[PDB]
């Protein structure tokens with residue numbers, strides 16, 4: 184099973200540097216070119232560069248938008264891809280993806296990681312306050328208020344409640360994000376059974392369970 | 398350089414209809430060596446990573462539904478989706494790999510569905526927030542169509558608000574929207590009735606949900 188998993192994103196100040204990694208498995212790493220592609224929130228994919236396979240000397244190429252400022256490297260022992268980012272600016276704020284690229288035969292990016300979010304800002308890290316939203320069917324929620332930077336993750340009953348869930352996209356107001364999540368279940372099931380929102384904010388290492396109590 | 402352009406920017410289609418979208422390159426992507434067009438299509442569902450659909454212009458990746466067909470050659474390419482499904486809600490990107498790689502700007506495919514009234518829920522501030530001197534009142538307008546909707550807040554009968562719409566639902570093609578009114582505790586405590594009123598084209602009657610502080 185092919186896996187790519189980026190790590191290393193989060194908050195960095197303007198002018199600072201940041202290094203992302205992309206752990207891979209399930210395929211002969213050295214047979215493959217690997218690319219990095221970024222995506223600013225709500226915007227298009229942008230190809231950033233690639234590092235070639237063994238057959239091609241593991242040489243690198245870059246979009247002119249980043250050449251001279253970003254560097255791609257690879258660990259061929261451990262099948263890890265790296266992106267070094269220097270002199271970061273506001274416009275570097277984005278989700279970064281690693282993608283498996285050319286093998287000498289196929290023109291395609293077959294697999295893509297989940298992405299890692301980089302924020303370029305002078306704002307401090309602020310953890311969220313998490314509040315319960317309690318009033319045939321019943322709709323409950325959690326309010327995840329006043330945090331920075333993105334992202335947060337919200338699950339319900341450690342992920343066992345997945346249907347009838349949506350999370351409302353975060354809105355930035357006076358330098359902090361707020362979002363909320365809804366969950367709808369049968370009223371015969373709550374409060375008789377437990378409903379809990381699980382909230383994480385990686386930048387502050389915040390982990391919160393909030394039971395919704397009637 | 399190689400400039401990739403896509404059209405339309407966005408469109409909406411009803412389940413079961415055909416979707417057509419276009420991708421242009423500033424120069425030919427037909428590689429003379431292999432006689433193939435180095436042009437690939439990717440689908441990006443809301444909050445997901447891009448996923449390969451088609452490459453070499455017309456080669457459908459294994460595991461990708463028959464309803465997706467890529468076509469064209471040289472400077473002009475088309476992605477066709479027949480019998481579109483609800484789950485096909487996504488931004489679709491083309492990408493050249495003839496000289497390094499470059500993505501087009503994407504085409505946002507939305508799904509048209511029958512009009513649906515929202516389900517509205519109002520939530521009073523939690524005691525754990527109130528302890529701290531703030532009071533957020535929250536209203537969910539859940540699972541409605543089309544996207545446009547109006548929310549009004551009334552406090553003791555008369556009209557710090559954050560609104561957020563979800564992406565379209567990949568299963569029922571509805572939208573939801575949250576409205577949050579944030580007050581100080583001192584201000585919250587001066588008034589009794591808190592009301593959010595949703596006006597949607599599904600009814601000439603606003604959907605009104607309310608609570609009174611004395612009833613808490």
Ligand SMILES: C=CCO[C@]1(C(=O)O)C[C@@H](O)[C@@H](O)[C@@H]([C@H](O)CO[C@]2(C(=O)O)C=CC[C@@H]([C@H](O)CO)O2)O1
Pocket residue numbers: 235239285290428430431494495496497
């Ligand atoms: C292995 C060489 C080139 O592959 C790339 C590259 O720049 O590394 C990557 C591919 O995705 C593709 O863009 C090719 C580009 O098509 C040039 O490849 C050919 C060609 O198609 O003409 C193929 C073989 C040899 C090569 C050059 O003639 C000498 O390296 O051209 O580039």
Ligand SMILES: [Mg+2]
Pocket residue numbers: none
């Ligand atoms: Mg050079």
Ligand SMILES: [Mg+2]
Pocket residue numbers: 587
């Ligand atoms: Mg007043």
Ligand SMILES: [Zn+2]
Pocket residue numbers: 242243244
């Ligand atoms: Zn070179």
Ligand SMILES: [Zn+2]
Pocket residue numbers: 552553587588589
């Ligand atoms: Zn009053």
